[PDB]
C-alpha cells in the first residue's frame, strides 16, 4: 500500500555575456558536478549568446546566480504541461 509520483522539465535560456568574470561564472556553474548543463553557443567568449538547457529545479538557483553575477539573460522556451 504505497506509491510515489515524480517528473522532470528542463528549460533553455539566452545569456549575453561581455566580461570575463561573467564568462567564468557560467563555467563555474556548469562546473558544479551536479547540474551538468550543456552550452549551445560556446560562451567561452563574450558577444556570443549562450543557450543551455537549465533544469527548472535549477532554473531558480540559476536565475539568482545570473543576477548575482550581475548578468543579463532571457527565457527562450518554457515548459507547458
Curated annotation (Swiss-Prot):
Compartment(s) of residence: Secreted
Domain of life: Eukaryota
Propeptide regions on this chain: 4-81
Family recorded in the similarity comment: Belongs to the peptidase M14 family.
Role, per record: Carboxypeptidase that catalyzes the release of a C-terminal amino acid, with a preference for large aromatic C-terminal residues.
Full protein name: Carboxypeptidase A2
Species annotation: Homo sapiens
Coverage span on the entire protein: 19 to 96 of 419
